[PDB]
Every structure is written in structure tokens, then in C-alpha cells.
Amino acid sequence: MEILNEEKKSKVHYHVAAIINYLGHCISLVALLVAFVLFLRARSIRCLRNIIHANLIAAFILRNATWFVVQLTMSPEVHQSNVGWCRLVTAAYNYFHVTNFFWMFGEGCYLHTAIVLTDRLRAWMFICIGWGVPFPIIVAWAIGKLYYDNEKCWAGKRPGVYTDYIYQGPMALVLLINFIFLFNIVRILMTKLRASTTSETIQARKAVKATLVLLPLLGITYMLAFVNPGEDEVSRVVFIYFNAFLESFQGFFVSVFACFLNS
Amino acid sequence: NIFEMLRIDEGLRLKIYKDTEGYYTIGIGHLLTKSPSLSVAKSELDKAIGRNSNGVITKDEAEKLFNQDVDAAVRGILRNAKLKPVYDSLDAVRRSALINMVFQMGETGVAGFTNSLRMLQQKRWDEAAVNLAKSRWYNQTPNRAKRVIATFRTGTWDAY
Ligand SMILES: COCCN(CCOC)c1nc(C)nc2c(-c3c(OC)cc(Br)cc3OC)c(C)nn12
């Protein structure tokens, strides 16, 4: 009755949220690609720093690419069926999510080192952190799903289940360490490198201004994932649209961030 | 990047060691004293470090001692009459590769490469790399020599 009319009103708004997410993800993907080819054409791709940038962009490409395959996973018949390719698709998306955290940390390792110590060889340690450390973490996560939580294509949320901390705990830990780095870069930039005009110092200043802008942009969407707003009609609709706009345009935010640093 | 450059091909150690001849050294190859006594090696260290006198030092401390040696190497370069005119005509990335060479063979050794220096001073960077590879130095430490040579030819850090 009127209950059904209320049910139909929510399906339309969810279908609207779904449209915002699909269009934001297409625009983000094209943008990352256009940034990626701009970096590869440059003869400055030999600079360690541009090596770091190209790997970050690539990392966000694979994630946004596999988001499309994930949507095809969210069919409820597929969700319950627990097919092999279905769990494999979920671990792929999780692996790429971890790499995005470890590559943002990598940029923070380079910037703290570049302002304290005066390229093709040093990059391997960054590639070892960005792509390498994540692989055993996802693997350990997977064995934990297999022995203990083999359901819902590994995308189920269930209470009292700590299995997802195997990979989530690391993501928080490197973020903690990037905060210490930020405080040290600012601490250093304001006392000892106050008057420096060396080329590494001007670049450092441009980063810290940019990082201060991107951090609230990217940070909001993560705290919103804890909100639990409620069944209030007006509060619920705004919660769903804002969160869908922030998650989908995220890669677009990153591509602007990356090209700005090319200067 | 010069500190990163030399840390790569020379090496970095943060507690006092003794070299093949038996003196006390630290860092990227900072000789502390020729005296047998370990005591004097720690004291000579204390005056330089200007902090707690101990066998272990700060990685930052290593770069401040590294800077000291980079200073003395440049004073040596500029006193040498074959080395000096090639150095001023070179740019920064190419100077590092000249200092890299002095750290390895001394100002006297780099002066032996008489053809390659006139090539570097004429910007003839492709000609100089063939000269420096026909040499016993290239045969004895090839992996370091190939890195240094490429920096000369391109003037970038891509190799390190
Ligand atoms: C809150 O998550 C935002 C996005 N994120 C995880 C996944 O990305 C989509 C992330 N993870 C890490 C681990 N660090 C950072 C920084 C950062 C920094 O924050 C302390 C310090 C310094 Br110094 C540099 C930074 O990045 C360049 C920024 C700006 N985002 N970010």
C-alpha cells in the first residue's frame, strides 16, 4: 500500500545513486588513462619521481578497472553461489585497494627522504613496497577466508568477524606513519629549510599544499563509511548521494593531484 | 643525490670498522685515525660529531661527515691543473660523476684519463665513453664504471 509507494521511492533514488557511481567511474578511468599516457611520453619518465607517479596512476587504473567486474559480482544469484572466479575477483579488488595505500605511503617515503638526503636502481625498493608487500597480506587474508569465512564471495559483512583486519590493519598503519612524515616535513620546512631555494625544496612546498587539499577530500569518504545515518528520509538521501559522488570521482581527484606535481 | 650516488656504489656503514690496512674508518669511507688506539678514533669522532662520542652514529651524522669529505675532494680537484678546467665546464650531474671517480681513485688517477677529459671539456660526450671503457678501471669494477660513464654521457641520474 503506502508502504509499497515508499519502497518504490527508495528504489528510484538508489538507481540514481547507481547512475552517479557509474558515470563518475567512467570519467575517473578515462582521466587516469590520459594522465598515464602523458607521463609515459615524457623523457622525464626516467626521473625516479615520475617512476613513482606512473606506478601510482597505474595502481588506480587497475582498481577502477576491476570495479566494473565487481559490479557484475553483486548479482544476488552470483553473490550466494560463491564461484571460484567470484572470490578471485574479490581478492583482486582488495589487492589493488591495498596497493593504493602503499603507493600513497611510497610517495611520502620519497618526499621525506628527498628533503633530507642529497634513479633506475633506487626505484626497486618503492616497487617492492607498492606491489610486493601487499601480495603476502592478501594471501594471508585469503587463507583466513578459506579456513574460517568461505561465504558471500568473500564480500560478506558479518559481525564479530576479524578476518578483514588482516589487510585493513596494515592500511591504517601506513597512514599513521604518513602522518608522522607530514609533521616532520612541515617541522623541517618551517625551521631549517625556511629560506632554501634548492629545487627539491620548492617542489616539497608544492606537495604539502596539495596534500593538505587532497587529504580532506579523500579522507571524508572513509569516515562516512562508519556513519550509519538512519532511516530518516531527508538525511538518508543526502547521505547516499554525497558518498556516491565522493567515491566515484576519487580517481579524477588523484589524476589532477598527479599532473599538478609534474610541474 | 650525490650522497645517494656514493651510498650505492661505494657503501655505507654506521659503526666503526677497520680497513684492509688496519686503520679506523666510518660511514662512506671516512678515515678517523691511523693510530692503533681505538680511543683516539672515538675522540676524533666526538670532535666531528659534536654529540655523544660512541661507535654508532646517526645516518644524518654520516651525511654531515660525507659532506666534509666532499668538501676536501673539491679542494683537491680545483688544485689540479688538468682536473680544474674540465670541472668548471661541466654541470652538476657531471661533477658528481667526477667526484665519484676521485673518491675511488684519487685526484691523481683521474688525471691519467687524458683523452677522455679533453672530450668531456669539448661536450663530446659520446666520444668520451668509449675512451673510459678501454681502461683497466672498467675491467676491475665494471658495474660501478658503467653507472658513472652513463651519467657523463647523458647528464642525468637515470642510472642510479
Ligand atoms: C585518508 O586517506 C586518503 C587517501 N589515502 C589512502 C588511499 O588513497 C586513495 C592515503 N593513504 C596514505 C597512506 N597516505 C595518504 C596521503 C598523504 C599523507 O597523509 C597523512 C601524508 C603525506 Br607526507 C603524503 C600523502 O600522500 C601523498 C593522502 C593525501 N592520502 N593518503
From TrEMBL, chain B:
<keyword id="KW-0578">Host cell lysis by virus</keyword>
<comment type="function">
    <text>Endolysin with lysozyme activity that degrades host peptidoglycans and participates with the holin and spanin proteins in the sequential events which lead to the programmed host cell lysis releasing the mature viral particles. Once the holin has permeabilized the host cell membrane, the endolysin can reach the periplasm and break down the peptidoglycan layer.</text>
</comment>
<keyword id="KW-0378">Hydrolase</keyword>
<keyword id="KW-0326">Glycosidase</keyword>
<dbReference type="GO" id="GO:0003796">
    <property type="term" value="F:lysozyme activity"/>
</dbReference>
<dbReference type="InterPro" id="IPR052619">
    <property type="entry name" value="Phage_lysozyme-like"/>
</dbReference>
<keyword id="KW-1035">Host cytoplasm</keyword>
<dbReference type="InterPro" id="IPR023346">
    <property type="entry name" value="Lysozyme-like_dom_sf"/>
</dbReference>
<keyword id="KW-0081">Bacteriolytic enzyme</keyword>
<dbReference type="InterPro" id="IPR034690">
    <property type="entry name" value="Endolysin_T4_type"/>
</dbReference>
<keyword id="KW-1188">Viral release from host cell</keyword>
<feature type="active site" description="Proton donor/acceptor">
    <location>
        <position position="19"/>
    </location>
</feature>
<dbReference type="InterPro" id="IPR023347">
    <property type="entry name" value="Lysozyme_dom_sf"/>
</dbReference>
<dbReference type="GO" id="GO:0009253">
    <property type="term" value="P:peptidoglycan catabolic process"/>
</dbReference>
<feature type="active site" description="Proton donor/acceptor">
    <location>
        <position position="10"/>
    </location>
</feature>
<dbReference type="InterPro" id="IPR002196">
    <property type="entry name" value="Glyco_hydro_24"/>
</dbReference>
<dbReference type="GO" id="GO:0030430">
    <property type="term" value="C:host cell cytoplasm"/>
</dbReference>
<dbReference type="InterPro" id="IPR001165">
    <property type="entry name" value="T4-type_lysozyme"/>
</dbReference>
<keyword id="KW-0204">Cytolysis</keyword>
<dbReference type="GO" id="GO:0016998">
    <property type="term" value="P:cell wall macromolecule catabolic process"/>
</dbReference>
<dbReference type="Pfam" id="PF00959">
    <property type="entry name" value="Phage_lysozyme"/>
</dbReference>
<keyword id="KW-0929">Antimicrobial</keyword>
<dbReference type="GO" id="GO:0044659">
    <property type="term" value="P:viral release from host cell by cytolysis"/>
</dbReference>
<protein>
    <recommendedName>
        <fullName>Endolysin</fullName>
        <ecNumber>3.2.1.17</ecNumber>
    </recommendedName>
</protein>
<comment type="similarity">
    <text>Belongs to the glycosyl hydrolase 24 family.</text>
</comment>
<dbReference type="GO" id="GO:0042742">
    <property type="term" value="P:defense response to bacterium"/>
</dbReference>
